[PDB]
């Protein structure tokens, strides 16, 4: 049918306010829920309905700053929320020591990302500390972990590392040669990219891999023309009407972005069928509460609401800003970031 | 011990064993964003968790507190880390923890933290004897669970348990020949044991796949495996393949077959074959067949492929 823009704006507004205890399992990643909402409002050109200054202070209260003795550099970055009980501090005073307080790579990424969307200039971000923390997360095989205490490692975090280095406009945060090696080794026999070597290729990891290379500006240099053609074939085969993440799996709204954005980066999204994709995405739209779901007649959530909108954006939906397919922010925001980088270079 | 929903449950704030600890509250400042509202019980457990965590108390009471924290939210990675610290400090029975995590994962098979916890345990015990059977059970609730397949490959690789996997794969492919995860597993086993360079193995596999394709011609997974094990050696180097496929076209046709053919013809043009101008037309004819009637949803893609072949071989 049609895009209920105002309804989606209210939906994101609610997300930034208060959630039911049934969402307690998102506690440690509240910052990424905030990102979905803010970036979502940005994409609909409605950031005006929120108090940018209040939110910026909240975000800065999530930064893990280096202590007086700077003995915790390997653990700096951002927290997903305040669940540890550390006293509110919007990056004003120095870091308060705590045996288990450290950043999370996906939170450092969405955190910096949110600050830029809100207009902040990142002056209160301890760039060197963040990059130090990032370096500490990389493994021998080139991939990354989410936290210094240890976690699983895969393509998801390689993408996070890439976005962080790109936004801070400094690649000292990683050993790019090893990361590229990891990305190459994840290519499957069917030509898609998996979470890691030998694993089943997947739409999510393919996006993470390709987007990471584009952010490093080395797509052409890492994959041959023959290889890129095979990857393109794998990606475009994902469209059934909407998109699925793996062969023989049911379509899911968020893949309209994961795969769609990959196709855009490979410059062949233009050859996909727009109408069937748009029709599928809209069929998952909740006309009553707003937002989108993974499947039609299913409950909506912040993740699918955001990615469904970015999916629509890829096709230039009337009323939605153009999304930067590799950085995952609006192109308007990516432009402001370009200016920010230029200003630093003085 | 004392279950969260037991009629005699008591808040930690009212327990004598916890009288000496001051609970630590969470504070999102003046204007909280994406704030989750918590019940009395929830906030009570975590207010004490914060306290114990903040003082790095390696006690038996702290260990029991994590069990409650996990029941309230198994996605809190910090809680799992601290529990591992305690498992070591108190030298707990890891065989018992295996039973615990085995139950937890069954209730939440799509949680990242629980799979990571089990992997750390197995590394500690250096004991994979339970793994393959456990994963097979989980794969029974969802045969495509990415977490399960990921764990299964880690185990097999780490403890070299290749002996029966190819048989397990054959069994699952009979249950659902369309499960893309199983085809990937098959390639995983073979390339890590015999490899595909052994002409006897390559033939066995190409034959096996053609048999599955004959049973269900419309299956991207089977076609992707077939092209996968041959694309690097060179599709045009297999003359009998081109004809065996052209013979299937009549009955077992599908866009996957037509696509395979286009790819064969292109390999030929790439290797300066005989009848360059004629082969190119056999390809273009197929591309248009895909665009206009076989894979219409990708109409513009196939036409783009066609235009690419012409400007490259003319």
């Amino acid at each position: 049918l049609d895009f209920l823009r105002d309804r989606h704006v209210r939906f994101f507004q609610r997300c930034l306010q208060v959630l039911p205890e049934r969402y307690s399992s998102l506690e440690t990643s509240r910052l990424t829920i905030a990102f979905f909402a803010l970036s979502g409002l940005d994409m609909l050109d409605s950031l005006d309905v929120v108090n940018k200054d209040d939110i910026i202070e909240w975000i800065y209260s999530l930064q893990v700053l280096p202590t007086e003795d700077r003995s915790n550099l390997d653990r700096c970055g951002f927290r997903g929320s305040s669940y540890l009980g550390i006293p509110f501090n919007p990056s004003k005073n120095p870091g308060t020591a705590h045996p288990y307080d450290s950043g999370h790579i996906a939170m450092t990424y969405t955190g910096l990302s949110c600050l830029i969307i809100l207009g902040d200039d990142l002056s209160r971000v301890d760039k060197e500390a963040c990059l130090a923390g990032l370096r500490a997360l990389q493994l021998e095989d080139g991939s990354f972990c989410a936290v210094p205490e240890g976690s699983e490692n895969d393509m998801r975090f390689v993408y996070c590392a890439s976005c962080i280095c790109y936004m801070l406009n400094n690649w000292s945060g990683m050993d790019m040669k090893k990361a590229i090696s990891y990305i190459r080794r994840s290519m499957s026999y069917d030509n898609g990219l998996a979470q890691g070597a030998g694993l089943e290729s997947h739409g999510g990891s393919t996006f993470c891999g390709i987007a990471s290379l584009c952010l490093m500006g080395k797509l052409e240099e890492v994959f041959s023309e023959k290889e890129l053609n095979r990857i393109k074939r794998w990606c475009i085969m994902r469209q059934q009407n909407g998109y699925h993440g793996r062969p023989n799996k049911p379509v899911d709204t968020c893949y309209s972005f994961w795969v769609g954005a990959t196709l855009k980066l490979l410059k062949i999204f233009q050859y996909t069928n727009f109408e069937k994709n748009r029709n599928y995405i809209l069929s998952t739209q909740d006309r009553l509460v707003g937002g989108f779901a993974k499947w039609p007649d299913s409950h909506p959530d912040a993740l699918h609401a955001y990615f469904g909108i970015c999916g629509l954006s890829l096709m230039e939906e009337s009323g939605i800003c153009k999304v930067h397919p590799a950085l995952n922010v609006s192109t308007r925001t990516s432009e402001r970031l370009r200016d920010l980088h230029q200003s630093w270079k003085t | 011990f004392l279950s969260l929903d037991s009629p005699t449950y008591v808040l930690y704030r009212d327990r004598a064993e916890w009288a000496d600890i001051d609970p630590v509250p969470q504070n999102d400042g003046p204007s909280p964003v994406v704030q989750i509202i918590y019940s009395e019980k929830f906030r009570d457990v975590y207010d004490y968790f914060r306290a114990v965590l903040q003082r790095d108390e390696r006690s038996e009471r702290a260990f029991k507190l994590t069990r409650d924290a996990i029941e309230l939210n198994a996605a809190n990675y910090t809680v799992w880390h601290f529990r591992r610290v305690l498992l070591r400090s108190l030298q707990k029975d890891l065989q018992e923890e295996m039973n615990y995590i085995i139950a937890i994962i069954e209730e939440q098979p799509k949680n990242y933290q629980v799979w990571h916890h089990r992997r750390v345990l197995v590394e500690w015990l250096k004991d994979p004897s339970q793994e393959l059977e456990f994963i097979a059970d989980i794969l029974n609730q969802d045969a495509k669970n990415y977490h399960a397949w990921q764990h299964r490959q880690w185990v097999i690789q780490e403890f070299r348990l290749w002996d029966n996997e190819l048989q397990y794969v054959d069994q699952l492919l009979k249950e659902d020949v369309r499960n893309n995860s199983v085809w990937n597993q098959r390639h995983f086993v073979i390339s890590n044991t015999t490899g595909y360079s052994d002409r006897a193995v390559l033939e066995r596999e190409v034959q096996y796949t053609l048999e599955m394709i004959k049973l269900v011609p419309h299956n991207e997974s089977a076609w992707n495996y077939l092209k996968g094990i041959l694309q690097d050696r060179g599709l045009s180097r297999y003359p009998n393949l081109l004809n065996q496929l052209l013979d299937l076209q009549p009955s077992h046709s599908s866009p996957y077959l037509i696509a395979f053919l286009v790819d064969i013809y292109e390999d030929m043009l790439e290797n300066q074959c005989d009848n360059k101008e004629d082969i190119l037309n056999k390809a273009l004819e197929l591309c248009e067949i895909l665009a206009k009637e076989k894979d219409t949803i990708r109409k513009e893609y196939w036409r783009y492929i066609g235009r690419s072949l012409q400007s490259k071989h003319s």
Partner: peptide
């Protein structure tokens, strides 16, 4: 129902 990515 949902997509847990972390």
């Amino acid at each position: 129902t949902k997509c847990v990515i972390m």
